[PDB]
Amino acid sequence: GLSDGEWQQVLNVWGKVEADIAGHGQEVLIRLFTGHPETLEKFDKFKHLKTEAEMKASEDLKKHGTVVLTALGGILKKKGHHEAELKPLAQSHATKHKIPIKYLEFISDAIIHVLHSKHPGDFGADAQGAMTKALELFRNDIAAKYKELGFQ
Ligand code: HEM
């Protein structure tokens, strides 16, 4: 649960992402894959990437970063009223991709890391607080659907 002022901060931060969605998406995925190499094993189309240089050179990885962040941005713009947008993603991630909730924690922290790396000094403490709360809400509503499905 976020206040109106917290949602305003989230959507202000998101404007930074929307100026370069592919560059942000690329770096988020690279941070996830390099920090948590077991996550790479869930992607049949990226498991061939052995080095970060290969990851950086991959145009398909940048494409997937655009898909991921476009979906998250659509959810964030609903300011919590995201049941219809979140349900298919929870279902596909539990039943088809088999993504444990832990990996959604990993990517949440990676988004925070990337924002500080690309906007040092311009991602303030209030903005970090509000973005963190928004990613927690996203993760928590996915977790409720995971429990319904019995997925661990
Ligand atoms: C911010 C969180 C994330 C969002 C919004 C997101 C969004 C999406 C979307 C929109 C798709 C394509 C449609 C679909 O299959 O449902 C996708 C595919 C996928 N997601 Fe996620 N995702 C997230 C986190 C993750 C994480 C943490 C993992 C794995 C560690 C992951 C693994 C996958 C896989 C394996 C695919 C299929 C890729 C393919 O082979 O083309 N997702 N995701």
From Swiss-Prot:
Q: Which residues does the record list as Phosphoserine (modified residue)? A: 3
Q: Where does heme b bind?
A: 93
Pfam families tied to this protein: Globin (PF00042)
For the biological process aspect of GO, one term held by this record is:
removal of superoxide radicals
Q: Show the GO cellular component annotation of the record.
A: sarcoplasm
Reactions catalysed, as given in the entry: Fe(III)-heme b-[protein] + nitric oxide + H2O = Fe(II)-heme b-[protein] + nitrite + 2 H(+); H2O2 + AH2 = A + 2 H2O
Enumerate the residues binding O2. 64
**Which InterPro entries does the annotation name?**
Globin, Globin-like_sf, Myoglobin
Q: Which UniProt keywords apply?
A: Cytoplasm, Heme, Iron, Metal-binding, Muscle protein, Oxidoreductase, Oxygen transport, Phosphoprotein, Transport
- Residues folding into a coiled coil are none
**Regions that span the bilayer:** none
Report the SUPFAM superfamilies cross-referenced here: Globin-like
User: Where is it located?
Assistant: Cytoplasm, Sarcoplasm
> Which segments constitute the Globin domain?
1-147
UniProt EC number: 1.7.-.-, 1.11.1.-
> What family does this belong to?
Belongs to the globin family.
The task this protein performs is described as: Monomeric heme protein which primary function is to store oxygen and facilitate its diffusion within muscle tissues. Reversibly binds oxygen through a pentacoordinated heme iron and enables its timely and efficient release as needed during periods of heightened demand. Depending on the oxidative conditions of tissues and cells, and in addition to its ability to bind oxygen, it also has a nitrite reductase activity whereby it regulates the production of bioactive nitric oxide.
Q: How does it assemble?
A: Monomeric.
| Protein name as catalogued | Myoglobin
Q: What is the native source organism of this protein?
A: Equus caballus (Horse)
The UniProt gene name for this protein comes to MB
